[PDB]
């Protein structure tokens, strides 16, 4: 059994799902985040948010008697831990008792322009704060509804929204064969990265550096974040094939609507397939890494990171990502909605040899 629910927003702002919480149900905008394991909502009125969840107005709310503080890359919050019923409008007819965190104090979490007022943690229990004992939204959903431990994502923000399938895969949301990469560490959605290619030419670095701290797939993060040692080599490689555009301090505008995508190369990521001896390739065209702002101005959609390598929403906008938690694997397939007016933005190919590639890349 699977719940196919429509997602709102884009890669920039973040993909949000509509949720009804408590009795009477309160309609809230919840951001889908695969890089976290906590289902948190605003419990008090705040700046830049239209609505919040009032626990005192809900008759089904049960306070667990404690609160938790969760820190992010740029943001932090402290919220009351409890449990209430959550019903997804267009999805399942029945309501489910899940763990909920009601934010009372926050620092740089609710930012301007952001349409969501809540966060949906879809990663593994071990990451969930306070501890792994606090059941994640999906773990409670799998137990109560008896649905397969698999959830899939389809992002369509080319420049309507998206589709989040909770309980399996919908074959109409993809084209071709699904290429599966195994989850090495069951915390975030860590996948093994072996190589990186730029318009045919490949940079040389120890494959252990591609898995710096962890090489993850995150829906919450906008751009493709690369580690400090990796990011520098990518900048040098793209420049040879293509002023403060590369450092994110400036833009790049191209006059009379002529696309800069012809001048830019193709970025390819090599991921180890389920069969250890073979590996597939996920290619992203400049349409996904040279994002348009506001004849039109364009920004560089690649930023350095202090800790991990993050496969953001910009890369996920081109592929139909499957999060098969039941079989310890992450799926990738070509998406039909990932086309700017017919012209494709993503490319999936394989199988390829790992004979002259190191045995293990996860350090």
């Amino acid at each position: 059994l699977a719940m196919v629910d429509n997602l709102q927003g884009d890669s920039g702002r973040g993909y949000y799902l509509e949720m009804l919480i408590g009795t009477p149900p309160q309609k809230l905008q919840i951001l889908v985040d695969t890089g976290s394991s906590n289902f948190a909502v605003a419990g008090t009125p705040h700046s830049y948010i239209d609505t919040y969840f009032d626990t005192e107005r809900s008759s089904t709310y049960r306070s667990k008697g404690f609160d938790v503080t969760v820190k992010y890359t740029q943001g932090s919050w402290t919220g009351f831990v409890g449990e209430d019923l959550v019903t997804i409008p267009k999805g399942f007819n029945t309501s489910f008792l899940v763990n909920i965190a009601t934010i009372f104090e926050s620092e740089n979490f609710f930012l301007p322009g952001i349409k969501w007022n809540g966060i949906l943690g879809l990663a593994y229990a071990t990451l969930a704060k306070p501890s792994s004992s606090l059941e994640t939204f999906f773990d409670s959903l799998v137990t109560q509804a008896n649905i397969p431990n698999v959830f899939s994502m389809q992002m369509c923000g080319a420049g309507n929204g998206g589709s989040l399938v909770l309980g399996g895969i919908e074959p109409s949301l993809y084209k071709g064969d699904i290429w599966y990469t195994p989850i090495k560490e069951e915390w975030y959605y860590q996948i093994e990265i072996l190589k990186l290619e730029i318009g045919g030419q490949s940079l040389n670095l120890d494959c252990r550096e591609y898995n710096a701290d962890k090489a993850i797939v995150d829906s919450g993060t906008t751009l493709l974040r690369l580690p400090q040692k990796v990011f520098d080599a990518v900048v040098e490689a793209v420049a040879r094939a293509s002023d403060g555009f590369w450092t994110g301090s400036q833009l790049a505008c191209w006059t009379n609507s002529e696309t800069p995508w012809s001048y830019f190369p193709k970025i390819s990521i090599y991921l180890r397939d389920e069969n250890s001896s073979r590996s597939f390739r996920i290619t992203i065209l400049p349409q996904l890494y040279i994002q348009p702002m506001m004849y039109e101005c364009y920004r560089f959609g690649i930023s350095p990171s202090t800790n991990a390598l993050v496969i953001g929403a910009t890369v996920m906008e081109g592929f139909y990502v499957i999060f098969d938690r039941a079989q310890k694997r992450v799926g990738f397939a070509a998406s039909p909605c990932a086309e700017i007016a017919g012209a494709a933005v993503s490319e999936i190919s394989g199988p390829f040899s790992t004979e002259d590639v190191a045995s293990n890349c996860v350090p």
Partner: protein, 62 residues
């Protein structure tokens, strides 16, 4: 494009603390394009010298 010129006079709402209030013709410097999310950008006014969020539709490139 490094700077952005204000097209219209904008008065930030009291319930919006990170929102910059600006006059028509004011120049801005967008801090980081990597942190840009939606129609609201965290810029720096060349007139006041303060850091805050500005609406993208209210500004034009230089």
């Amino acid at each position: 494009v490094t700077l952005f010129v204000a097209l219209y006079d904008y008065e930030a709402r009291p319930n919006r603390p990170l929102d910059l209030s600006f006059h028509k013709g004011e120049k801005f410097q967008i801090l980081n394009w990597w942190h840009v999310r939606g129609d609201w950008w965290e810029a720096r006014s060349l007139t006041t010298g303060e850091t805050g969020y500005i609406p993208s539709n209210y500004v034009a490139p230089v």
